[PDB]
Amino acid sequence: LSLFSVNDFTCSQISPAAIASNCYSSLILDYFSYPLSMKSDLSVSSAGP
């Protein structure tokens, strides 16, 4: 997160400290080219394209 610049950080059923501190069985990291212009459609409880 320090390497990049934070623009949006939204989570469901979990807190930022929970994901950043809790130990997990195996973390899955997905990255993609997502512009900030369509932030209304990148959400867990969203119906965007």
Partner 1 sequence: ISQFNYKQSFSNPTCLILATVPHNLTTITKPLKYSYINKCSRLLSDDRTE
Q: Judge contact between 10 and 34, C-beta under 8 A.
A: no
Closest approach, Cβ 42 to partner 1, in A, equals 24
Q: Of 6 and 23, which has the nearer Cβ to partner 1?
A: 23
Interface with partner 1 in residues 4-33 (CB under 8 A): 14-15, 17-18, 21-23
**Number of residues in the chain:** 49
- Select from 42, 48, 49, 32 the least CA-distant residue to 10: 42
Closest approach, Cβ 25 to partner 1, in A, equals 11
Question: For 1-49, where are the alpha helices, taking DSSP H only?
Answer: 16-21
By CB under 8 A, name the binding residues for partner 1: 14-15, 17-18, 21-23
